[PDB]
Design a protein around this ligand. Structure first.
Ligand SMILES: Nc1ncnc2c1ncn2[C@@H]1O[C@H](COP(=O)(O)OP(=O)(O)OP(=O)(O)O)[C@@H](O)[C@H]1O
Ligand SMILES: Nc1ncnc2c1ncn2[C@@H]1O[C@H](COP(=O)(O)OP(=O)(O)O)[C@@H](O)[C@H]1O
Ligand SMILES: Nc1ncnc2c1ncn2[C@@H]1O[C@H](COP(=O)(O)OP(=O)(O)O)[C@@H](O)[C@H]1O
Ligand SMILES: [Mg+2]
Ligand SMILES: [Mg+2]
Lengths: 127, 467, 477, 188, 467
């Protein structure tokens, strides 16, 4: 058998006691990235379907929580994400703005205006 | 015992028990949950790890959450206090009328009665409905398939069966809705309240509903049939009576099983169903039987994918059915109710050794005359009514009278027909059809037979409308 | 803990436990789990052992203790089982006490070779006019019964079993047949009702029933046919005759497909593994007919298959048609129409039993077969005659249920039919005439039927007396 | 990530990854010789029949195994590198392939100190003088500082001559191959 | 050498040799068994392990058991002392008549003849069967293949060919029954003993029998075709004679492979088949050629799964045959026997330069009229045979007469139907079909040709019909 976190980099870190200076509860290091799926090491306190944020300004949803790693799906091109990046928890499941402030506005899947008519009112949020 | 969630892949949760593993099929409660989440164990992956199928949304779970081992499979509250109460698969009430107070709890994973706890003689369940009791009698403790299921009277027929069985034999009933639309679930709740099979005030209900919602994870829609079986098995064993168990829908039972099997990571069988399709169906259908104490008669609504009768789902369910009822849109058009297709309906116990020679002969004569009228209708359509003989116009008249007499007014439909419901015993039905076949009533008008109870009601109707 | 004769379940799930230990466990050996179940060790792997559990995997847990029994999978056999119902492992389930058998036979034992066997030379009477006259079944033959849902196959099997009582109540040890009925993936209600039906016909005193009903784990349905076949091989190898009825052999194939897929094996055609043909040929090759140097016993087999929508060219039906020595095609159209048994004599054949047929039945059934064959091709004068005679015969071969006939009555009835005595009788009254004629000959003229049975042929004097009887009765009808 | 220093010879597999992690950890902090000695020590320590029987049973919890291994490491006064490696192999349940990890690190360290395994095959044994000139010439093959590790097997299957393997380099002055060559070319 | 079993999965056993490894195809003996268990090596797995296929039941093998290398592949006894005997995969007699005494053994895994050994001669082999002789004339020394689903007439046809061809054959003959009924092998053995083709008490036996019947594991069915191939190869190469080689059923040779391929850890091909289907079929089937050292006239019965000629196995076999004969279930359902499909059957020697010009012209005329009838069939089935021109009605009548005439009564079916077996010399076949084609017999009833010998028998039958 084999795990995806058994790569020699993680084992190297853990052999010489370098795994204590890294916060593996609210941050993680990307093990793999490809075809829009990142496999992240750490994030031990991350909830299923929670939104994490990569170092390069991208977002992602953590769908597969396995013993070794977390399978995050990236919200954009995986061009900007490289193995070894840093992924931080956002803390909250994905939610969107709501209200009459959206009427007449074109928005994308996450409630960001894309019609260039200015910010979106967004008094209330909803999961 | 306490373990930790180690993995969460979709609706599958891998837990780790450092102290001691729970057996397969147990139920585990996730501690730290705003609403009760129950995980049913399905595998022992080794290294003290177990894999569980979740009965509710796993979103918001963390790797490390504590999980408490209940020690027994899903245990639901069974008893006489479940009658008239909706409750989901894990037994929690969902009708917001307070807790289901009972002194009994039953595990939903039980075993079929042993080979010696089995009635060796066939029986007949008298539902008080002419067409069902004549052309397709319902065996006691036998599965009945029910086809149609779209604006043809499936719900009214289900409700009438509930009422008759709770009135004739006094047994209660269970309505397990496997993958039930919430809109139709609420509509059914209210229809039952209106007709009276559920009573929110005086606690004289005759049905216990168990809803597996259509938006529950696949691991919940796969087990609600078992919760219904448990609620009915209490009444069979403990109360020692004959119960009815309506499973709507059974194709959704197979679909939920298939989805669970795929999620656990098993190779699909012939048409993409679970490799355990036959056993997954058999373990449930084998608990609907006639023990020496009571009996459970089940009524599966059945859906045939792609209209294919050889698809593994119906090909596997039909192996268990002991009868069949076919509601037809073409008969509700004629105003006949219940719109049961007299010729397409089938029964295994329509055998002279079981139902007796007289019942068998009457049923066969009615079927033959109805087939003759069906054949003659082509001649009527093409060559015109004039072409008939005098030994064929007579058969046409007799068949029309029989079609009218097979219709009946239901007690749970007095707000649709203006009449008063009739629960026709069996002897009355057999005598009425025997007399009509003999020709004793050839002088009456056809409409004197429409929507009446026993034959004497047809006589009275003829007198009242002719005079 | 002894890590040679005992191991610990590494991983249960799917009904295939992985055990760690049992270093001295033989392949295909039977092991016993702590809870009480039993399993068979398929995969002797370098680091573990793959044991399929003959029961419900709920009872097994990771950590449980597996102890090897020390013997290959075997079942108790003997005369002690007659009249008892037993599960797939030979444990009684009718609650009439312990089985108490002295001999144990392996379920995976190999079929007899080419020299032990001998051509089929004795008839296996089924008391069904159509089967006995048109598709005779010898002793040692393998005659597939292939049909659909509710077309009357279990009826053929049970009529055969009930009919064997004429011989199992007599004294001739060379005609007694001990029946076995294997029920696979079949409602337990049906098995219980069938056992009651047999007990009411005094047909359990020589019948074993092996149950693997639909509520039984897949390995038990996989292993029930082999337990039954060993229970029958006991009689075969001891110079007695046996008759085993696998029912159905398609439920066993479904169970084996489950077992294979759960083991992650490469699905083939219709997701069935590649071993299905081997699965069934391994089983149906044991229904042999030993020669007198090996005892002279025999083991007939009547496998049952349920086609789907009448498809006879499916995968499993074609496998078992390539394994068996004939066919009895029960047609659903005929069954629903009113012909019962619904045997489609056009497509049903008997490879071997033709030579085993009884002479008295042979001569009459020859002309019956010719007449029916001619009628089949024309469905003026000769055409009208053929239609009339064919309809007479077809209505003659209709039969009741659980009312098998001795060969002599079949001979008398078919003789009356084929010699044209009924060519004037209205086609509807043929059944009534048949039922009255049978009572007549069974009441008064026992000497004629007894002489036909003893002499084993319709002698010229027997022919003349039968002619007189039938013509006089037809006059008085 | 930390830019691990790659080993000279790449070993692949589970043992390869664990051994490469250990080699990278040791190469920085420069503890390769001591850690190799400690690995050889644990090669026997775990091999003890009691310890082996207690570590090849997957029903003793990983907690107990880690505790026992921590006790043994403390009782043996090991480097933190080897103790952490044993702890890591125990947590991941990779004890059954610990000897594979030691063998991999042995192969990896041998190349580190400049060794090229060699093999010589002949029909019969050799006289020590001839073996001495073989040593000399084979050392001629090698580069500067690359010690040689000769192995002289005796294969009578060949009809004579000599066969030499130096790393991946191969020279076959054996009678059998030349017989085969002549027979084939002549057959054409 | 000496290794020890390490794994035993189904019929696939892994054996570890610390000393010298055995080469591939080399056979090993499992030491400690009641009988002889031979393991044929198939792979080297590294770590000094070899995977092997067991030539007998593997129940009772214990991990760590001892296996002894034998040094050479399975070597069987070959010679003139294997005539009249019955052998199995490993050459052991199974007729209970004493060891096969030969002074010369053959390894069953020899290589195929090189290219400079093939023979280009192409004669015609007359079988006395009208359909086979007219449309798909078999050739002497070539490969022949009888394709057919279950129960269409493969074995009856091959027994008819045995009877005819191998009664008029002065050379030797070899029947390798791979994966067929054991009682069929027994019947063949006793038919030969009776027919004089085998002398149990002399040395004038002309048939060698090999048997890997269906009751044996996959490892024995896979490698039993090679045993018959070796027994025939000896009589060809060394004895320099002309051999007949009947194989029934060769599909079971490939099928068995797919049973072990799964266990050998190989990725399955199109439909669960081993990835090496065509290579194994080629290596087996190119050893059955007629070289310059002798001649083998091999007839192979080939089973078409689920009557699917698109299956990889028959589809691959088609490319290894000179003459094919596609038995069809539809034609067999029409009553025609043999059910040879005249349009699927083909042959290499159907060349005007080999068969003639009257034979070739008649065959092509029959095929043309049958193809025209096939084209009409779809319309004839719905619109009826009344919406046809007169030329089309003539074509239909002639085509039906020809279809019936191709049917023939075999002698091996004397028991089945009571008719008398008929042989039809080639000239009579050609003349009869010429006459039918020209229209000389348009006044006869089509049922006058059903199951007759030469055409004059059809005329006699038609005359008898008039009476
Ligand atoms: N000879 C007969 N005469 C009249 N009715 C018959 C006869 N044989 C069978 N039947 C009827 O057919 C029904 C089904 O019979 P049977 O159980 O033999 O078929 P089956 O194929 O075994 O059914 P299943 O496939 O569901 O097991 C019975 O209820 C019986 O009434
Ligand atoms: N016995 C009856 N008398 C009058 N109307 C009936 C009867 N049975 C069914 N119907 C009619 O059939 C329609 C559909 O009823 P129901 O079965 O409750 O809905 P669904 O078929 O969608 O479940 C109703 O509108 C009702 O008027
Ligand atoms: N010449 C023939 N005459 C009559 N029937 C035949 C003839 N040849 C084949 N058959 C039919 O074929 C059947 C035997 O099929 P067989 O070839 O033994 O099966 P398989 O195709 O599996 O070998 C018989 O039952 C018979 O009806
Ligand atoms: Mg049945
Ligand atoms: Mg055959």
């Amino acid at each position: 058998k084999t795990g995806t976190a058994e790569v020699s980099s993680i084992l190297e870190e853990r052999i010489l006691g370098a795994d204590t200076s890294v916060d593996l509860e609210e941050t993680g290091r990307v093990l793999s990235i490809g075809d829009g799926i990142a496999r992240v090491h750490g994030l031990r306190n991350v909830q299923a379907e929670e939104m994490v944020e990569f170092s390069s300004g991208l977002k992602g949803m953590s769908l597969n929580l396995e013993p070794d790693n977390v399978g995050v799906v990236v919200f954009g091109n995986d061009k900007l994400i490289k193995e070894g990046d840093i992924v931080k928890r956002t803390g909250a499941i994905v939610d969107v703005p709501v209200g009459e402030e959206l009427l007449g506005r074109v928005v994308d899947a996450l409630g960001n205006a894309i019609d260039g008519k200015g910010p979106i009112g967004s008094k209330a949020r909803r999961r | 015992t306490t373990g930790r969630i180690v993995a969460v892949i979709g609706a599958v949760v891998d837990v780790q028990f450092d102290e001691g593993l729970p057996p397969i099929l147990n139920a585990l409660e996730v501690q730290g949950r705003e609403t009760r989440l129950v995980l049913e164990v399905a595998q022992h992956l080794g290294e003290s790890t177990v894999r569980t199928i979740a009965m509710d949304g796993t979103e918001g779970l963390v790797r490390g959450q504590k999980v408490l081992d209940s020690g027994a499979p899903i245990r639901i509250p069974v008893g006489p206090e479940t009658l008239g109460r909706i409750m989901n698969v894990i037994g929690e009430p969902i009708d917001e009328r307070g807790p289901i107070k009972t002194k009994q709890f039953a595990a939903i994973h039980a075993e079929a009665p042993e080979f010696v706890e089995m009635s060796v003689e066939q029986e007949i369940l008298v539902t008080g409905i002419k067409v069902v009791d004549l052309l397709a009698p319902y065996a006691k403790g036998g599965k009945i398939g029910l086809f149609g299921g779209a604006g043809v009277g499936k719900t009214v027929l289900i409700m009438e069966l509930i009422n008759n069985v709770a009135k004739a034999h006094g047994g209660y009933s269970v309505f397990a809705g496997v993958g039930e639309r919430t809109r139709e679930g609420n509509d059914l709740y209210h229809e039952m309240i209106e007709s009276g099979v559920i009573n929110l005030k005086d606690a004289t209900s005759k049905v216990a509903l168990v809803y597996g919602q259509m938006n529950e994870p696949p691991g919940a829609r796969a087990r609600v049939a078992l919760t219904g079986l448990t609620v009915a098995e209490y009444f069979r064993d403990q109360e020692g009576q004959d119960v009815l168990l309506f499973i709507d829908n059974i194709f959704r039972f197979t679909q939920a099983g298939s989805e669970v099997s795929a999620l656990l990571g098993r190779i699909p069988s012939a048409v993409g169903y679970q490799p355990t399709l036959a056993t997954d169906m058999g373990t449930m259908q084998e608990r609907i039987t006639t023990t020496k104490k009571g009996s459970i008669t089940s009524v599966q609504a059945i859906y045939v994918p792609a209209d294919d009768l050889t698809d593994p789902a119906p090909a596997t369910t039909f192996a268990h059915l002991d009868a069949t009822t076919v509601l037809s849109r073409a008969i509700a058009e004629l105003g006949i109710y219940p719109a049961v297709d007299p010729l397409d309906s089938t029964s295994r116990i329509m055998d002279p050794n079981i139902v007796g020679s007289e019942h068998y002969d009457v049923a066969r004569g009615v079927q033959k005359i109805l087939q003759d009228y069906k054949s003659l209708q082509d001649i009527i359509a093409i060559l015109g009514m004039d072409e008939l003989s005098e030994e064929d116009k007579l058969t046409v008249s007799r068949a029309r009278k029989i079609q009218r007499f097979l219709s009946q007014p239901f007690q749970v439909a007095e707000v649709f027909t203006g009449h008063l419901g009739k629960l026709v015993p069996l002897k009355e039905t057999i005598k009425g059809f025997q007399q009509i076949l003999a020709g004793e009533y050839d002088h009456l008008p056809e409409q004197a037979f429409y929507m009446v109870g026993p034959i004497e009601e047809a006589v009275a109707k003829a007198d009242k409308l002719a005079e | 803990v002894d890590l040679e004769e005992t191991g610990r379940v590494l991983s249960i799930g799917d009904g295939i436990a992985r055990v760690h230990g049992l270093r001295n466990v033989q392949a295909e050996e039977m092991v016993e789990f702590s809870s009480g179940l039993k399993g068979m060790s398929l995969n002797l792997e370098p680091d573990n052992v793959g044991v399929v559990v003959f029961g419900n995997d709920k009872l097994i847990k990771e950590g449980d203790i597996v102890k090897r029994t020390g013997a290959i999978v075997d079942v108790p056999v003997g005369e002690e089982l007659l009249g008892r119902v037993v599960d797939a492992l030979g444990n009684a389930i009718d609650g009439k006490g312990p089985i108490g058998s002295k001999a144990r036979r392996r379920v995976g034992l190999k079929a007899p070779g080419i020299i032990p066997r001998i051509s089929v030379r004795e008839p296996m009477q089924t008391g069904i006019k159509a089967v006995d006259s048109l598709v005779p079944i010898g002793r040692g033959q393998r005659e597939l019964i292939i049909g659909d849902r509710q077309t009357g196959k279990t009826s053929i099997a049970i009529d055969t079993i009930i009919n064997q009582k004429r011989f199992n109540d007599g004294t001739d040890e060379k005609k007694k047949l001990y029946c076995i009925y294997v029920a696979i993936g079949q409602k337990r209600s049906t098995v219980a009702q069938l056992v009651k039906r047999l007990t009411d016909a005094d047909a359990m005193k020589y019948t074993i029933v092996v149950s693997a009903t639909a509520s039984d784990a897949a390995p038990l349905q996989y292993l029930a046919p082999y337990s039954g076949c060993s229970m029958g091989e006991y009689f075969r190898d001891n110079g007695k005759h046996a008759l085993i009825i696998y029912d159905d052999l398609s439920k066993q194939a479904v169970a084996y497909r489950q077992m294979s897929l759960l083991l992650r094996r490469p699905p083939g055609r219709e997701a069935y593994p590649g071993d299905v043909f081997y699965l069934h040929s391994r089983l149906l090759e044991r229904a042999a007919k030993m020669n007198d140097a090996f005892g002279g016993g025999s083991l007939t087999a009547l496998p049952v298959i349920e086609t789907q929508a009448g498809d006879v060219s499916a995968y499993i039906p074609t496998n078992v048609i390539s394994i068996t020595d004939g066919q009895i095609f029960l047609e659903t159209e005929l069954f629903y129409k009113g012909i019962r048994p619904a045997i489609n004599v056009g497509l049903s054949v008997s490879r071997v039993g033709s030579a085993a047929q009884t002479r008295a039945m042979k001569q009459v059934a020859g002309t019956m077969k010719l007449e029916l064959a001619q009628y089949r091709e024309v469905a003026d004068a000769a055409t009208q005659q053929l239609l009339s005679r064919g309809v007479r015969l077809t209505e003659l071969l209709k039969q009741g249920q659980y009312s098998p006939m001795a060969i002599e009555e079949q001979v008398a009835v078919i003789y009356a039919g084929v010699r044209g005595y009924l060519d004037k009788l209205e086609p509807s009254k043929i059944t009534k005439f048949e039922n009255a004629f049978l009572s007549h000959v069974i009441s008064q003229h026992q000497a004629l039927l007894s002489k036909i049975r003893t002499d084993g042929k319709i002698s010229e004097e027997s022919d003349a007396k039968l002619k007189e009887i039938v013509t006089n009765f037809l006059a008085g009808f | 990530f930390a830019k691990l220093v790659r080993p000279p010879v790449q070993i692949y597999g589970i043992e390869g990854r664990y051994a490469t992690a250990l080699y990278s950890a040791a190469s920085k902090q420069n503890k390769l010789e001591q850690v190799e000695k400690e690995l050889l020590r644990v090669g026997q320590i775990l091999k003890e029949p009691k310890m082996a029987a207690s570590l090849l049973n997957p029903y003793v919890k990983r907690s107990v195994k880690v505790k026992s291994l921590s006790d043994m490491t403390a009782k043996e006064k090991f480097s933190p590198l080897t103790s952490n490696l044993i702890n890591l192999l125990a947590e991941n349940g990779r004890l059954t392939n610990t000897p594979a990890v030691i063998s991999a690190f042995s192969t990896m360290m041998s190349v580190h100190r400049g060794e090229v395994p060699c093999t010589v095959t002949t029909a019969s044994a050799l006289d020590e003088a001839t073996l001495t000139e073989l040593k000399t010439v084979l050392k001629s093959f090698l580069s500067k500082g690359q010690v040689l590790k000769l192995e002289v097997k005796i294969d009578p299957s060949i009809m004579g001559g000599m066969i030499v393997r130096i790393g991946e380099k191969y020279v076959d002055m054996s009678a059998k191959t030349k017989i085969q060559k002549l027979s084939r070319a002549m057959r054409e």
